């Protein structure tokens, strides 16, 4: 009956991204040290998890969105979100 | 029917913090390389997620606790837990 | 009615591990920069969370699997998964 969140962060400011799944809809709230705002991420899912890493000063993000037994990976690589190649025989 | 956990860690020992939401109550078990113990975190929530970063050797933690459509951020910055400024129009 | 995932990553390639709990069974899909494959992790749980850290170039992983009010820690330290010492009075 409650929403579910995943979070990642990078740097020392830091930057934060919080993802929230809500009735099959996943949104993103972001923080970069000046204020909270709403991010470009809007994707279907009943559950979400996230991890992130830095390549120099480039941020790369992977969000794992799941409806039922199917799980989809979304990749941020600085040029808008794109679908990843993840798979599973759940 | 089961409890839900989130975890973060830092350093090389390392330090670990595991957060558990249980019937709207969120507790914290901690590890610093000598034994598991119970942490100062005790907050209302049906769901939890966490991220953390280091500023030199200072640890900063952000825990995201959710009941229903409302989500609250708690900040550790070395001086006890305090409420953060996170928001969302869920 | 949906599966639940947790994710961690390390390095710059990077390496990714995605954990999925599905009807009390937790599996692992892995990525090391050449393709997605299925990992050695197969453990009972209705919920999962993960964190990881590096000691030089050695990866250490901690997965937190939960059925009901009981929560179990599994440790990867380069020599196969082993049970950890975590505890809680949930
Ligand atoms: O497209 C980006 C990608 O190749 O990055 C590495 C892994 O996250 C893959 O699942 C993903 O498809
Ligand atoms: O008070 C600490 C704070 O400013 O830190 C950065 C963000 O986590 C904010 O949501 C939070 O309120
Ligand atoms: O056996 C490995 C271990 O000691 O590593 C540190 C902590 O994760 C403990 O819970 C765990 O048992």
Author numbering:
A (entry chain A), B (entry chain A), C (entry chain A): 1 to 90
Question: What's the publication's text?
Answer:
All three of the pH < pI crystal forms are mediated by the calixarene, devoid of protein–protein interfaces, and highly porous with a >50% solvent content.
Apparently, replacing the acidic side chain and the consequent increase in cationic character facilitated the involvement of this protein patch in calixarene complexation and crystal growth. The RSL-D32N mutant yields an altered assembly, in space group I213, with a single calixarene at a special position (crystallographic 2-fold axis), mediating a C2-symmetric junction at Val13 and Lys34. While the calixarene is evident in the unbiased electron density map, the model building was challenging due to the poor resolution and the C2 symmetry. Surprisingly, the Lys25/Lys83 patch of RSL is devoid of calixarene (confirmed by S-SAD) and adjacent proteins in the crystal packing are separated by the van der Waals distance (∼4.5 Å). Despite repeated attempts to improve resolution, testing both large and small crystals as well as cross-linking or dehydration, the maximum resolution obtained from this crystal form was 2.6 Å.
